[PDB]
Amino acid sequence: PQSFTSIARIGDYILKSPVLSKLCVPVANQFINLAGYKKLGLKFDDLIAEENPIMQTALRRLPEDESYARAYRIIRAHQTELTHHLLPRNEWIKAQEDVPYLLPYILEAEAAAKEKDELDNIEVSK
């Protein structure tokens, strides 16, 4: 449960600093390759663990045909994974695809929550 709102903070910063960005992103790119996951038709937002309220605010909200999309991949994943194989090289999700389709809502919802947390314990000075 390291927060997405928190990964935003850190990863935005690094993306902005042309200093940092040039150092980090090569590796990060190298990383999201060695993961293996785009070879099981998986976009990264598929991987995010869901058994928690925020993601269930964030999937109830996710556009229909978008969820049908997720779905097919997630089943394609399992299916292949169980065949103990990797997909036909040209079925792999391509580097431009791995887009944070979910991340707004996760962020949208995280935001909303932290707000309510605050507004439940908002104190008073007289």
Partner: protein, 248 residues
């Protein structure tokens, strides 16, 4: 750890029984008992072995009945309430040389000779280490090693100082069958006999072991096959995606 405190590693002699398919050499066991009887019985108990247990392994029914009765076990009191002896039965356990822990030590400079019944398992290396400590009493305690009064040197014991003096000296046993009653042949036997003593089940144990594996292996391979069959629909199962017109 200094190689002196450890003791020298006994080597991998090639015993009759080493291997997954190897019964003991019962002829060998038969010899060890004599090598046992005449030599080491003088000091060493073999209490968890019973006369009957010999029958069918090293001897024949009377052969063991004979040995058995050469000793007077205690026996239930007469009508008056006074003790009595009696010879042994096959139902008995081969009696120790000493009447208690003390006289065992009295007779050995205060050493307590280990009961041997379990020796080939109560030691690392075991068969080898037994052979080697018995054929490894070298002539003199190596340059510099200063040995206490009533203690010998052995590289195979830890820190060499063994309270048991050498005991195998060629031919001291008259090998009844008529084999070279050497020391490396007097020894190799009492080892094979002492092996038995700590692991009597032995030949059956590999017998049954054989069956267990052959059946169990086959089940393993058989099970595998079966599995791919019941999975065959899921393994070769194949999906397809067709996005659907936006209206719901």
């Amino acid at each position: 750890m200094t190689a002196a405190e450890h003791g020298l590693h006994a080597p991998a002699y090639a015993w009759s029984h080493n291997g997954p398919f190897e019964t003991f050499d019962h002829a060998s066991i038969r010899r060890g008992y004599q090598v046992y009887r005449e030599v080491c019985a003088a000091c060493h108990s073999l209490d968890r072995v019973a006369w009957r247990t010999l029958v069918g392994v090293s001897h024949t029914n009377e052969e063991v009945r004979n040995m058995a009765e050469e000793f007077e076990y205690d026996d239930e009191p007469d009508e008056q309430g006074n003790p009595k002896k009696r010879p042994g039965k096959l139902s008995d356990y081969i009696p120790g040389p000493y009447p208690n822990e003390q006289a065992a030590r009295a007779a050995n400079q205060g050493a307590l000779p280990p009961d041997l019944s379990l020796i080939v398992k109560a030691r690392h290396g075991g068969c080898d280490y037994i052979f080697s400590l018995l054929t490894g009493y070298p002539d003199e305690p190596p340059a510099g090693v200063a040995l206490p009064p009533g203690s010998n040197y052995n590289p195979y014991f830890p820190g060499g100082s063994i309270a048991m003096a050498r005991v195998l000296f060629d031919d001291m046993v008259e090998y009844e069958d008529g084999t070279p009653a050497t020391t490396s042949q007097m020894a190799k036997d009492v080892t094979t006999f002492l092996n038995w003593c700590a692991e009597p089940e032995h030949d059956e144990r590999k017998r049954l072991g054989l069956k267990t594996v052959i059946i169990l292996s086959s089940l393993y391979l058989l099970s595998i096959w079966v599995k791919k069959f019941k999975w065959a629909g899921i393994k070769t199962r194949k999906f397809v995606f067709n996005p659907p017109k936006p209206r719901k």
